[PDB]
Write an enzyme that holds these catalytic residues in place. Structure first.
Site, mmCIF file in Angstrom:
data_model
loop_
_atom_site.group_PDB
_atom_site.id
_atom_site.type_symbol
_atom_site.label_atom_id
_atom_site.label_comp_id
_atom_site.label_asym_id
_atom_site.label_seq_id
_atom_site.Cartn_x
_atom_site.Cartn_y
_atom_site.Cartn_z
ATOM 1 N N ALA A 225 -1.597 -4.437 -6.410
ATOM 2 C CA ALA A 225 -1.644 -4.790 -4.998
ATOM 3 C C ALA A 225 -3.089 -4.935 -4.544
ATOM 4 C CB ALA A 225 -0.925 -3.754 -4.162
ATOM 5 N N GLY B 189 -7.381 0.748 1.824
ATOM 6 C CA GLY B 189 -6.377 0.705 0.773
ATOM 7 C C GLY B 189 -4.971 0.355 1.232
ATOM 8 N N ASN B 190 -4.041 0.330 0.281
ATOM 9 C CA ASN B 190 -2.633 0.076 0.569
ATOM 10 C C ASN B 190 -1.750 1.132 -0.098
ATOM 11 O OD1 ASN B 190 -2.026 -0.969 -2.238
ATOM 12 N ND2 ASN B 190 -3.462 -2.555 -1.560
ATOM 13 N N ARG B 191 -0.439 1.026 0.094
ATOM 14 C CA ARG B 191 0.485 2.083 -0.315
ATOM 15 C C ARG B 191 1.043 1.927 -1.731
ATOM 16 N NH1 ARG B 191 0.566 2.061 5.798
ATOM 17 N NH2 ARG B 191 0.502 4.304 6.278
ATOM 18 N N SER B 192 0.480 1.007 -2.507
ATOM 19 C CA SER B 192 0.966 0.755 -3.863
ATOM 20 C C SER B 192 0.862 1.979 -4.768
ATOM 21 C CB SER B 192 0.198 -0.409 -4.491
ATOM 22 O OG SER B 192 0.743 -0.758 -5.751
#
Ligand SMILES: Nc1ccn([C@@H]2O[C@H](COP(=O)(O)OP(=O)(O)OP(=O)(O)O)[C@@H](O)[C@H]2O)c(=O)n1
Ligand SMILES: [Mg+2]
Length: 212
Positions: free
Chosen positions: A95, A27-30
């Site tokens: 994102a 995952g990402n930090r969005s």
């Protein structure tokens, strides 16, 4: 008042999660806060808003907005393909994870073998192509989002200006920050609440639609 009274808007927000197994993922930090804010402002101004949300754990679903929760980049793409034909405006603020685990384990993985990565499809590019092929008559405006950093090759605006033309979208939101239009207009995005920034974005969409 209600600029967007007749406008069917499709908004994506948050980050996607690509599973290694039932427990773990990439995952990402969005946060998805900006996309949610845009969703609310559109709906407040009379738009019929469908919001496709990825990883938005503590966010609350905006009222008056059809919610479609998804998990992964693929699930996001299928959701967009389903709801895009009826949409006049597509706000691509999610994102999307660029890479995905090639194979997903049926059970939780218990030194381990390396994880094989495969590139995900460009959902935005899919939408841009569909409109170009005349398969999206209702679509009138497509908005992209980008985070850019200055590197030795070029400036933030330098990279931002390039991506706007590459994606083929009408408007690009870059994060300070910028609002880049396909006609060649450039507007600064001053640091503020997600609400005020959402107002600026929706204003750009409205202004663009008038030119359409
Ligand atoms: N697989 C992807 C990746 C990006 N996006 C959309 O395309 C826009 C550009 O996002 P960005 O990640 O910055 O573009 P990339 O093509 O992934 O460029 P980069 O490799 O530098 O990240 C965003 O609005 C995002 O929602 C998408 O639809 N599908
Ligand atoms: Mg990317």
């Amino acid at each position: 008042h209600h600029d967007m009274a007749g406008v069917k808007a499709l908004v994506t927000a948050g980050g996607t999660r690509e599973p290694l197994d039932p427990v773990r993922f990439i995952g990402n930090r969005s946060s998805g806060k900006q996309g949610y804010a845009v969703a609310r402002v559109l709906a407040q101004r009379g738009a019929d808003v469908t919001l496709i949300a990825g990883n938005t754990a503590g966010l609350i679903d905006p009222a008056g907005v059809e919610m479609v929760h998804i998990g992964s980049a693929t699930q996001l793409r299928d959701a967009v393909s389903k709801h895009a034909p009826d949409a006049n405006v597509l706000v691509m603020a999610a994102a999307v994870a660029d890479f995905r685990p090639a194979h997903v384990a049926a059970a939780k993985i218990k030194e381990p073998s390396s994880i094989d990565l495969v590139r995900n499809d460009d959902v935005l590019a899919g939408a841009v192509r569909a409109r170009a092929d005349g398969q999206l008559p209702n679509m009138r405006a497509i908005v992209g989002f980008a985070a850019e950093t200055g590197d030795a090759n070029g400036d933030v605006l330098f990279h931002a200006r390039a991506k706007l033309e590459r994606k083929g979208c009408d408007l690009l939101v870059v994060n300070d920050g910028w609002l880049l239009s396909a006609d060649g207009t450039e507007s600064a995005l001053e640091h503020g609440s997600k609400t005020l920034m959402a107002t600026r974005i929706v204003d750009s969409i409205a202004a663009f639609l008038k030119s359409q």
